[PDB]
Symmetry: D4
Subunit: 163 residues, 8 copies
Amino acid sequence: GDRFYDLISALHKSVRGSAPDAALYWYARILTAGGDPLYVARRLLAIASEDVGNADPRAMQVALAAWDCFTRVGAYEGERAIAQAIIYLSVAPKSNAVYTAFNTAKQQAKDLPDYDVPPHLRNAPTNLMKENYFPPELKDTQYYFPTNRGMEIQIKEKLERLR
Amino acid sequence: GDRFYDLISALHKSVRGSAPDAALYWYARILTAGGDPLYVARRLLAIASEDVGNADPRAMQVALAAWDCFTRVGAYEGERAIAQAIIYLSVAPKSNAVYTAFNTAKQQAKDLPDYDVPPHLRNAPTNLMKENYFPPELKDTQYYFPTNRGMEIQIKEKLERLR
Amino acid sequence: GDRFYDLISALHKSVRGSAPDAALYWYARILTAGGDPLYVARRLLAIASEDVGNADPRAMQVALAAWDCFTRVGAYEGERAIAQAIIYLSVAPKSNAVYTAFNTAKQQAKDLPDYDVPPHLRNAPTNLMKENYFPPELKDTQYYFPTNRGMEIQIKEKLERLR
Amino acid sequence: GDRFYDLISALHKSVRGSAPDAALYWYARILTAGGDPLYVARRLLAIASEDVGNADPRAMQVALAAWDCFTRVGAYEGERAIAQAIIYLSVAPKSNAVYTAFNTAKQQAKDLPDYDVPPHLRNAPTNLMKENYFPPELKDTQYYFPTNRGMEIQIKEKLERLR
Amino acid sequence: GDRFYDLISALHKSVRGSAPDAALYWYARILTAGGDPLYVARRLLAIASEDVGNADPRAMQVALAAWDCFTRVGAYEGERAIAQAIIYLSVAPKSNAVYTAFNTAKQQAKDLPDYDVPPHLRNAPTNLAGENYFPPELKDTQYYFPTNRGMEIQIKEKLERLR
Amino acid sequence: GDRFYDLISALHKSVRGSAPDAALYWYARILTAGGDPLYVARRLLAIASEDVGNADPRAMQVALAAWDCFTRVGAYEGERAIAQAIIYLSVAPKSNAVYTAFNTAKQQAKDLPDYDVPPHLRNAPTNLAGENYFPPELKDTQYYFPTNRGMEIQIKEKLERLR
Amino acid sequence: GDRFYDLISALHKSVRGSAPDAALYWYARILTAGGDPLYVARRLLAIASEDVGNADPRAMQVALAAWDCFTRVGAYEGERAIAQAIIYLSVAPKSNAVYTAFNTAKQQAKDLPDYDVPPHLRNAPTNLAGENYFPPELKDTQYYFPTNRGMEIQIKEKLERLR
Amino acid sequence: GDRFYDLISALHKSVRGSAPDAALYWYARILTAGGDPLYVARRLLAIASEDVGNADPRAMQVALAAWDCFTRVGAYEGERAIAQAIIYLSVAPKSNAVYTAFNTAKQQAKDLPDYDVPPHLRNAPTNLAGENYFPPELKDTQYYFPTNRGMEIQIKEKLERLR
């Protein structure tokens, strides 16, 4: 199915475990086994969302910029930029809070009754096509639990403050 | 006309009200009702301009980077990146100062006389095609009132300082 | 030739003069006179290079992100994002040091003798196609004079330090 | 083969040597000798990866943004934006730690036995296709030695801390 | 308001009914009502898919090219290119065959059991005369019924041979 | 100065008059006068829309492809590809039909009353023989008059059948 | 799980076997199983290369255009455009000639000695009747064997003349 | 080293000489020598311009499409698509007419006086029978000499009528 699944898994684990050296090893193993640098780049973007999230909201951009290097310069400089991204994500503060918050929200939308939009939340349009915030039943619902890492330190302080 | 108008409105309200949990709920509701992640992404960009503006000038880039994830990786990781953007905009400092400043300027351009460009403001070209700042009648006009939030704290201090 | 030359000039002057209100006025005047938002966006990028430069190296990205909003969402939200860019560049620290440094270097390349590359500066390749720093005659040449504004404060301190 | 090799080499050396004036000179020499601004832009991206790396992880984005200016506005404003990038990379903190770490990892992957993925590193998937971190033999392997420059100061402190 | 979505509907119906003159009228009305040309551009892509399909596969590219003109050149050249796309789509051969084929296939995938992939079609084939592409329950199923129009003339000829 | 905009005009007139040799001369003069090739590329897209239109819908794509070469490869390959686009446009069948159609439709939308969307054309039809695409005041209006040139030969044949 | 990669295989085999109806079924099953449409879009590009090749060079562009629709418009329009690409590829003339040609050439480049570039083919020719494009060891080698299908009908005619 | 640029030259000469099999061999050798496929992709675009020109204007698009596959899918699908582009270019009708036309026009613009734009061709015409597109010194000049190959067959027919 996917010849590189174990390798990519080990790479993921090393990044989430803040082990840049082992991450570079597994990355090297994938390339030398004939794996595509963009196969890894796509999974790096997934790691930014799943494991770093709002602890470092710039991580997404570092990974996209590495991909842009591949797209503009080529495969070999691309490889090097993606290595730089791997190291960045490895040493970045980690938080899966946004990941798990979204997953919960999505499962609740699927499962719970389709409550009406409370009338006071209606009519808040945007410039697009032409020039309690929950339903009452769900009051106090919390999906997002910011950690004490990276930019989530300030976030957590702000959300608690205004809680 | 737009089956998701109320949902999107509730999402907008939750973001502008710095309620990340409720924002994720309404986002989840849209997706589970068959709404497109990019339908929401476009409205997120509008929220960056309208409700965050220069309080956090990097907000635009976070939302564009989420969209880039959708475009490169796909729908499911895209959804997750757009969730991260929703949370970012929810907890960001808020200011509609740039939004309302532009709207005023634009209405005045439409309505007021078409005053000449003051001669001393003429001939300030750029490298493009080949290698009082108001009209006198409008002296002292002010459209932009920076708030005390985010990067608008410094801005306001600078504009007042040089006022 | 260009019906909007005076207007764009007045806009440029207001931005370089850190007058966000007047900049929004001239921007509004251009749009209401039928001028294209991207006509202005291209000139905003030129202003980032010419008038802000390394005093705020992120200014380029704010202007490109505004253009990306236009490209993805559309004309009306585009207009609003470009307004946000105008305000950002208006309040940004200003420096034309990079602009004038490049212009000087380029005129000297055109005019001065084509001196050989000093042998000790040869062979410093990059990964691209496959996996005294002046000529002696020009020793001590200086084109770049960082200002005391924005990120040029640190730059100037570093270049002087290592001078 | 490449008429601009010596010039580009001298440019590279000046950037790596934090000599912005000489870098602008060699850049000017290339352009006036008929060299393409994107020929230089591609090599600037390579310099970001090789010589700046994680000492300034935003350097990649500055160079890509300069290229975007060329792509959207044109050759002449492009030239100016790429000059701004040259100066940025010249004054940026320097580190070849990510470069040499990747090169080592890659050579080891090529040369050493293809060790199995340790079972405890398996099954760590991502949302992609549908909704000791080394092998035992290589325990304690280190490729990445962050310097004391730029953002590598914090990185080094963190990796040592958790060592 | 609701009147706005009526203009969009009139435009869609006119393009679908091969009425280029009326299509241009409704487009012009949409523009003068403050409608965003990119909002229109998105609907045009949906039209290429739904109403033209493989009667003219190039249709998709004409509408994307119009969008590219808007993104690169600006709003006014964009509106002109989108008008050209509107006329192109209006006079193009119409076919809803690909659209209705995909919908029928989705309802079967949703409504009928999740039949096993026939053994010979598996990533590693297993012991089953292995000539069927459908599960045996779905043998000889047809979703796609090419029209006698445009490029579907030849496709319908070919599919009848195949059978 | 004004002489520069005269070169642009000479180039436009030559392409429109199907004079490829003169077109290349004026382009070459524009380049030697310091004119930006992308500035020229933008005018070429306007030409494809205004002067070629649906006589050759692929025209748009040739000019976009030339722009892509400039963005990806560089200035000099770009200038060569733009020359190719200039010759392509110069020898292409000419038609101003789509251009003048769109302008006429806009003047009607601006000058005549905002007639209601016919009931059957509304997003939810209402009680009205519902065969008209125009408001009854505009019955049988024609804006688009295909030439006898290029792809418009066949279009004009078809529209006459329809009527 | 492994069942998922079986759906991908069934889809590939159906497109290759020119079975558009079965192809749409397997696509629909992939979607309902939670499969990402872009994951499918990437496989479609590999199919255009491997199974269609130069029998229809436009194939590549239809699949890229479907991807563009997904990136610009969204997931649901994207899935529809990808269905259109699936049908396009299914009914297209099939040829594996370019694919097998490239593979054979790579095995020779890997397995046979690194023969010198014939003197007349060098960047600076040297003293050698200089009519050979292959090294003399490889004289008259053929990798590319166009089918009698699609655009390869004419190519095969031409290559036989040449010989 | 210099041997590397010899491989590039052999590849260019083979494509130009319409030798697809040798072209694939030299490409394969370039890859096994560590050559970057995008470096090759850039040369292919220069080839489309220089050696194919308007004998097949679609050539440019096939090479850009191959590049898109590399950027979106990855290195290995990219190398395959680039091989397809190599074969496409090798079997395409060859014409150097657009290339040599543009070069001749540039040498005239550089070597002859900067003649005035004929009065009738100016942005605002002035008092001069105003039928000339060239300055009177350049009357009847021809740069562009279409071959009898590909799309230039028809172009040459047309230009002879015009004269």
